[PDB]
Design a protein around this nucleic acid. Structure first.
Ligand SMILES: [Mg+2]
Ligand SMILES: [Mg+2]
Ligand SMILES: [Mg+2]
Ligand SMILES: [Mg+2]
Ligand SMILES: [Mg+2]
Ligand SMILES: [Mg+2]
Ligand SMILES: [Mg+2]
Ligand SMILES: [Mg+2]
Ligand SMILES: [Mg+2]
Ligand SMILES: [Mg+2]
Ligand SMILES: [Zn+2]
Lengths: 136, 116, 49, 128, 96, 122, 23, 86, 72, 99
RNA sequence: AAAACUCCAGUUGACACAAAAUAGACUACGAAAGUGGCUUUAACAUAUCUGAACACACAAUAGCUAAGACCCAAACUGGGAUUAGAUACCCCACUAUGCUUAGCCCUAAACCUCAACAGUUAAAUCAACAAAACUGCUCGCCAGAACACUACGAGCCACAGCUUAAAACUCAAA
């Protein structure tokens, strides 16, 4: 029982959460970089609901790419989502960095429930040419 | 399964470009390298974060956020005792892997003879 | 033998008068080129569902 | 230039030709085939017209005919595709090999040498 | 005298192991066979030691996979969800 | 030689797809290509949102056309297919039955490739 | 280790390039 | 962005088990070779250095496999002292 | 030898005998040795087909007093 | 490498030692060891083998000979003038059970 | 840490003239350089060997002209931090360039530094490393060094160059 694969939208989708299926669940995109992260909760109908990041609190310079700042941003985003009624979210991780799971922990501790951990890292398939290798 | 090593090194009987270009000669030794340990952890931060948040929300008194501060103290004590038991166990106990001492002893018991 | 087989096979082709019936038979028929295998080497076709 | 429909080598010495219809004749021709078939047909025609017995494949005349066919193919590929250095080098090497074989043939047998020179039309020039 | 050994064709020789797709035909139109050799999560092609085929077999497999992905017969970055309940052949270790 | 064609259309069930198949057969017969048979794979689902001519398509079918085209009309057929509007995409690929299945004996454990370094005590 | 001659040749080439750039 | 949505790299949570699912996703990414690929493509790598690093990784993997096979072969004699003294 | 090929065929058809191999007795005659002896004494007569020889050897083994455990 | 004329053949990756020339070399070996003890000689059994270290030491003890199945020190048989005493009669025959 | 932009950042619908993850635990093609997203076409020589600096044809990338696009990377440039000084190691935006067409001297650690054609190791056995050591034929080079990838001379679609290549002086050397 309990298949790790996501349910297909096709035939009968037998998983219910608060009277809703899976395609009608709001999304919580997280763009975690090497020094800053942003958390925005968007509904299923593509409508912005909440937006909280490290720069919208009090952290400056390299203090944004920390675990405490990411956790506070996640807690603030979860509170702003609960103020309007979201409950269930779908975390989307974009990029690597120190604050990759701190935002998820903050969103969970804020009062939200996570049922699917997704990530769409934009890894280029020999795409654009990055910058030159710096000399440490 | 180990891959092939026929046409890899640049030899006299290989009329092609060398695939593998090692810096050291491919001769196995009779010693096991020391494993890595004691890295950067920096754990137990959510308790401190929520304690600072509770202190910033209300007043800076001690009787206002007793639950958060006692949870932080308990988490710190648990982390300390976990580090202590880790340092104690990682000196005589082996789980999954083995001790490099016995490994190099067994390698010296059956050494390699590449010089024939 | 090969040219006799080719002559026997060329009897069923598409020219100018066999177009409407051929496209109707093609639209009224389906083909499945999907077939799975196992660890022992046996061919298992998903047409038995 | 051989005709587009002239039955290649693989479908030449086979019984039953007049009984064949039109679709099989058009499929088994040079239209839906490969250029290698046309090259082999040209080589066979040259070996049947110029030299006598075409069964001797390891002979020098067959090698000369094959090198001439390869030279013609390389010249066609060069006049069709301008920037092509590898094919141009291969053409030059084939010309040099054909000239060396013609020199050797003239040194060992002048009769077949002049016969090939009259047939293919090429003339062995003395190197300065 | 007659008890001397004779160098024959070396008996006690077990037949060489074949392959799981040696007596078959590899085509780009087959989506099930081309999807059974890809990861169901990231859509990554497994290595040679994971599948267990020869050189030409794996080459034809990956060529058919790439042709189906380019022409439009199988997803690239993921796997078709209708081809998940199939007998697993490749050796995996995740999920557990 | 022999070739195939993976024709991809939109969603029209019968009339428009029949008309496109008729046009394709007429073009093949005019360009000197003997049509052999036709295989229908059925109306399936596209693996990704295609962006072909103008509109975005997400529900199309598949068709297979077998014919013997010469080595001088492939570019003309590709141009005719790209000029069409109802046709999403279609690459001319040779028939797979031309290349026969090569025999094989399987894999073999390669021994330890020695004879690479000198035999000195060092 | 074994690059002294190469460095001397590089210095000579640099001096030659500087002399060419001068006049 | 022309493909489907929540299908690629998608896991589930069983009764709030969010850390186990995250560890499983991390293990899947490390097995498929994506985190290391992103760390490599973070900076532009020259083809010479690319070939050198690939050869280094291949030789190190071969040496590690040989050492692991040797250890697995020699572990059959990891006993005590059957012959005291002698 | 040829008895090696006979034992190879026996192991390919049947397999391992029910009796345990005793490497201490020099004159230890196992099932494979009896099969080889029967095949030799049947070839000494005058038969060429291997299937008839195998059937006759199996019949001789069943008649001498042993149970042939074959994998069908 | 120096084991080609002393092996008959291979039986399933197993070298079979031929007993034809083995008995010839054994007769010359027993003849050389018999005249050693017959002419008042010292026989030393050196065999570094922990599996059969007890049986060899008892055979040389009951026969009045000498054995050495323990650790062999460096300059023992060579530098015998600084490891024992002034002068030591070196054994004129040493048998190796395990080379 | 600056500094840079606040027509900035975030999910979504509409978009390329360079590069082509996973197949890369494969050793493949090509004389070498070089070449792994898909489809079609033409095609990868020589039934003795060697053989040019008295010749011919190719040859990584870097530089030019005559026609265009230009996300990104980046010679130069200007600004911003430290150092007594920093024209550089850190960051920001951009040019020449990486792209398509045609023409130029043909430049390398062109390094697998091992010339090509064949073979061998219980006859032959190497100062030392590296990739263990030799038999037959043939082309170019060497015999101290810096001087000197140097002037001149000889040839060049090149006018800061390429191919060939010294003399004068010093030392007991490298
Ligand atoms: Mg090195
Ligand atoms: Mg391009
Ligand atoms: Mg030559
Ligand atoms: Mg530009
Ligand atoms: Mg830019
Ligand atoms: Mg160039
Ligand atoms: Mg190179
Ligand atoms: Mg060189
Ligand atoms: Mg040469
Ligand atoms: Mg030159
Ligand atoms: Zn096979």
């Amino acid at each position: 029982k309990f298949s790790i694969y996501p349910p297909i939208p096709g035939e009968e989708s037998s998983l219910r959460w608060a009277g809703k299926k899976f395609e009608e669940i709001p999304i919580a995109h997280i763009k975690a970089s090497h020094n800053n992260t942003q958390i925005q909760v968007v509904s299923a109908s593509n409508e912005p609901l909440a937006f909280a990041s490290c720069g919208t609190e009090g952290f400056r310079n390299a203090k944004k790419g920390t675990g405490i700042a990411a956790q506070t941003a996640g807690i603030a985003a979860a509170a702003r989502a609960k103020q309007k009624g979201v409950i269930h979210i779908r975390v989307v991780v974009k990029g690597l960095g120190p604050g990759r799971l701190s935002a998820m922990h903050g969103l969970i501790m804020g009062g939200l429930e996570v049922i699917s951990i997704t990530d769409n890292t934009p890894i280029p398939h020999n795409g654009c040419r990055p910058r030159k290798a710096r000399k440490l | 399964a180990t891959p092939s090593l026929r046409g890899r090194l640049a030899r006299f009987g290989n009329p092609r470009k060398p695939v593998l270009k090692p810096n050291k000669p491919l001769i196995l030794a009779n010693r096991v390298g020391e494993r890595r340990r004691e890295k950067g952890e920096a754990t137990c931060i959510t308790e401190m974060s929520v304690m600072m948040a509770c202190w910033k929300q209300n007043e800076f008194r001690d009787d206002a956020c007793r639950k958060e501060i006692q949870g932080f103290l308990d988490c710190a004590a648990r982390a300390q005792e976990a580090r202590k038991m880790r340092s104690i166990q990682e000196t005589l106990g082996e789980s999954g892997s083995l001790l490099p001492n016995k490994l190099n002893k067994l390698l010296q018991r059956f050494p390699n003879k590449p010089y024939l | 033998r090969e040219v006799l087989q080719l002559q026997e096979e060329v009897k069923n082709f598409i020219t100018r008068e066999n177009l409407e019936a051929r496209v109707e038979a093609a639209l009224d028929s389906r083909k499945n080129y999907n077939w799975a295998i196992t660890r022992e080497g046996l061919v298992v076709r998903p047409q038995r569902r | 230039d051989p005709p587009p429909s002239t039955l290649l080598k693989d479908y030449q010495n086979v019984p039953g030709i007049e009984k064949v219809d039109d679709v099989v004749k058009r499929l088994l021709s040079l239209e839906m085939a490969n250029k290698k078939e046309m090259l082999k047909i040209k080589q066979e025609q040259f070996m049947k017209k110029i030299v006598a017995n075409p069964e001797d494949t390891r002979s020098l005349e067959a090698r000369i005919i094959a090198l001439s066919v390869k030279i013609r193919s390389y010249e066609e590929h060069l006049e069709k595709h301008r920037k092509d250095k590898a094919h141009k080098r291969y053409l030059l090497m084939s010309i040099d090999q054909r000239k060396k074989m013609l020199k050797n043939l003239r040194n060992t047998n002048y009769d077949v040498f002049e016969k090939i020179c009259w047939g293919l039309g090429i003339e062995y020039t003395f190197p300065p | 005298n007659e008890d001397l050994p004779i160098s024959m064709e070396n008996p006690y020789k077990e037949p060489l192991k074949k392959c799981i797709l040696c007596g078959k035909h590899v085509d780009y139109k087959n989506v099930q066979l081309l999807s059974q050799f890809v990861s169901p999560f990231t859509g990554c092609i497994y290595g040679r030691h994971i599948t267990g085929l020869c050189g030409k077999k794996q080459k034809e497999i990956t060529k058919a996979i790439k042709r189906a992905q380019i022409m439009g017969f199988m997803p690239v970055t993921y796997k078709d969800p209708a081809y998940l309940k199939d007998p697993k052949v490749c050796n995996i270790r995740y999920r557990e | 030689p022999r070739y195939e064609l993976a024709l991809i259309l939109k969603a029209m069930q019968r009339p428009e797809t029949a008309a496109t198949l008729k046009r394709t057969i007429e073009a093949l017969m005019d360009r000197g290509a003997i049509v052999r048979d036709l295989e229908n794979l059925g109306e399936r689902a596209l693996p990704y949102r295609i962006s072909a001519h103008s509109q975005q398509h997400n529900r199309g079918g598949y068709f297979l056309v077998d014919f013997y085209a010469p080595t001088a009309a492939v570019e003309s057929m590709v141009e005719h297919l790209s000029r069409d509007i109802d046709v999403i995409r279609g690459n001319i690929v040779k028939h797979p039955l031309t290349q026969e299945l090569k025999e094989c004996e399987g894999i073999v454990p390669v021994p330890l490739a020695e004879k690479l370094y000198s035999t000195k005590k060092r | 280790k074994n690059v002294l001659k190469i460095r001397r040749r590089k210095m000579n080439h640099h001096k030659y390039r500087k002399l060419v750039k001068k006049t | 962005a022309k493909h489907l949505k929540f299908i690629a790299r998608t896991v589930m949570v069983q009764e709030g088990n969010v850390e186990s699912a995250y560890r499983t996703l991390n293990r899947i990414l490390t097995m498929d070779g994506l985190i290391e690929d992103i760390k490599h493509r973070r900076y532009y790598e020259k083809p010479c250095r690319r070939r050198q690093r690939e050869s280094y990784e291949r030789c190190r993997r071969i040496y590690n496999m040989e050492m692991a096979r040797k250890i697995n072969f020699l572990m059959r004699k990891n006993r005590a002292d059957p012959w005291q003294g002698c | 030898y040829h008895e090696d090929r006979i034992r190879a065929k026996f192991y390919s058809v049947y397999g391992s005998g029910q009796r345990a191999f005793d490497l201490f007795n020099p004159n230890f005659k196992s099932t494979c040795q009896r099969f080889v002896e029967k095949y030799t004494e049947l070839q000494k007569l005058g038969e060429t087909d291997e299937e008839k020889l195998f059937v006759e050897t199996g019949k001789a083994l069943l008649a001498e007093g042993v149970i042939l455990r074959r994998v069908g | 490498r120096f084991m080609e004329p002393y092996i008959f053949g291979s039986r399933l990756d197993h070298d079979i030692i031929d007993l034809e020339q083995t008995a010839t070399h054994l007769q010359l070996a027993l003849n050389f060891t018999a005249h050693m003890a017959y002419r008042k000689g010292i026989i030393l059994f050196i065999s570094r083998n922990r599996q059969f270290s007890y049986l060899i030491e008892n055979m040389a003890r009951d026969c009045g000979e000498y054995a050495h199945t323990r650790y062999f020190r460096g300059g023992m048989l060579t530098n015998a003038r600084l490891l024992f005493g002034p002068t030591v009669r070196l054994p004129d025959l040493i048998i190796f059970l395990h080379t």
